[PDB]
């Protein structure tokens, strides 16, 4: 049996659909009295929110994979038990497993596959304009913030740099510091005078009062998005960009969204946390989840139904997951650090607050920030 009481924390817009899912899981276990609220900052806040009072904190949490590496090391979350690991081994595709990998042991129950795409009225461009950056911008609106760095770092990795080395584990291993990282930077410039390129820091309202043509945006917002652009919805993958003269994949991050046990939780509570977090993020939740957001499942069973498998945002996802396409965000103890930085070293760029006289210089001083 299975008994305790446990706090979940999700974002404010999908309390409703939790509590659909804590319901299915009370029909199987009755005994467990569970509250679900949103967290205090968001999910984007989960290690934070936790952090400053983890016996305050909810006993499961949604968190993207990307904070997994500072909690482990922190003592927050604790591994998955090894039954519990072979069952998000066999349920969930390969890089779900990779997203909540730290030093060779799972902390949290991966649920859904996030990759930014295109997102844009059909309308006003077609498939082939979206295909490239400059022929996108020449034709429409693409409204965008280059003050977030979960945009625009990955145009970094498209100018052939890596992030933590080869697979995102290396504490040194970022080598932006480069002529490769100066074509980035100077991307990023090129676009203040794009007229076709307008910051905003809500993209999401820009499509809904028609003022802009197309969004990068992610799978959080494809059914927000249907709902906007009705009929003329559509989606594709990112398109390339010109880096020194070259036309390349223009990347984005791959993200693995998941739910996490506090490790204060013990005794009865402890299990019934492990429990709930298993629930949530198996396959018919994830279903459920998709059903009200569009967020993509991870589970394999879930991404080859004829639901998933006929909706355009899911193909255009499982294209951005391919190598070249873009990188799963790594889980770095550091990566407080690196976002902390990033984003100040983009927007500067693209402002010019930084001019190309100091890119290298500026480059430098970011390897060494993000390394320690
Ligand atoms: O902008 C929308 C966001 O805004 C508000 O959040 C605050 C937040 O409370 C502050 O702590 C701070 O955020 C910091 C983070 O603390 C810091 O860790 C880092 O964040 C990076 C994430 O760790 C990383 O995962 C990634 O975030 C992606 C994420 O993987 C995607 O799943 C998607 O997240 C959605 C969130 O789950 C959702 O909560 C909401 O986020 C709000 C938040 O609720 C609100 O309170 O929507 C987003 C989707 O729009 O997208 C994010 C990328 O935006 O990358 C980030 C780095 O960008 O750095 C951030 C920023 O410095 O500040 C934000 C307000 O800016």
């Known amino acids: 049996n299975v008994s305790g009481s446990v706090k979940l924390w999700v974002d404010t817009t999908q309390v409703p659909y939790y509590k659909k899912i804590v319901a299915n899981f009370n029909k199987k276990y009755p ?5 679900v609220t949103q967290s205090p900052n968001g999910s984007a806040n989960a290690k934070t929110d936790v952090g400053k009072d983890p016996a305050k904190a909810a006993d499961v949490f949604e968190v993207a994979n990307d904070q997994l590496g500072s909690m482990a090391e922190a003592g927050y979350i604790n591994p998955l038990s090894p039954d519990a690991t072979k069952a998000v081994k066999n349920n969930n595709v390969a890089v779900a497993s990779e997203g909540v990998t730290w030093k060779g042991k799972m902390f949290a129950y991966p649920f859904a596959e996030q990759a930014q795409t295109i997102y844009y009225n059909k309308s006003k461009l077609t498939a082939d304009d979206v295909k490239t950056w400059d022929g996108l911008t020449a034709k429409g609106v693409l409204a965008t913030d280059f003050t977030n760095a979960y945009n625009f770092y990955p145009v970094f990795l498209s100018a052939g740099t890596q992030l933590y080395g080869k697979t995102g584990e290396t504490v040194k291993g970022t080598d932006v510091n480069s002529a490769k990282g100066e074509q980035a930077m100077a991307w990023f410039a090129q676009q203040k005078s794009n007229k076709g390129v307008m910051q905003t820091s809500n993209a999401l309202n820009q499509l809904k009062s028609g003022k802009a043509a197309a969004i990068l945006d992610g799978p959080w917002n494809s059914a927000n998005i249907k709902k906007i652009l009705g009929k003329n919805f559509a989606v594709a993958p990112y398109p390339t960009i010109k880096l020194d003269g070259k036309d390349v994949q223009m990347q984005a991050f791959l993200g693995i969204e998941t739910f996490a046990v506090n490790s204060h939780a013990s005794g009865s509570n402890q299990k019934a946390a492990a429990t709930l977090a298993s629930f949530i993020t198996n396959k018919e939740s994830q279903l ?19 639901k998933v498998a006929s909706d355009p945002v899911a193909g255009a996802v499982m294209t951005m997951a391919k190598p070249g396409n873009s990188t799963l965000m790594p889980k770095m103890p550091q990566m407080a650090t690196f976002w902390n930085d990033a984003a100040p070293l983009i927007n500067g760029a693209y402002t010019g607050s930084i001019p190309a006289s100091q890119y290298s210089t500026k480059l430098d001083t970011f390897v060494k920030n993000i390394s320690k």
């Open 31 to 35: 005994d467990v009295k569970v509250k």
């Open 288 to 306: 459920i989840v998709y059903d009200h957001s569009g967020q993509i499942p991870v589970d394999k069973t879930a991404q080859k139904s004829s």
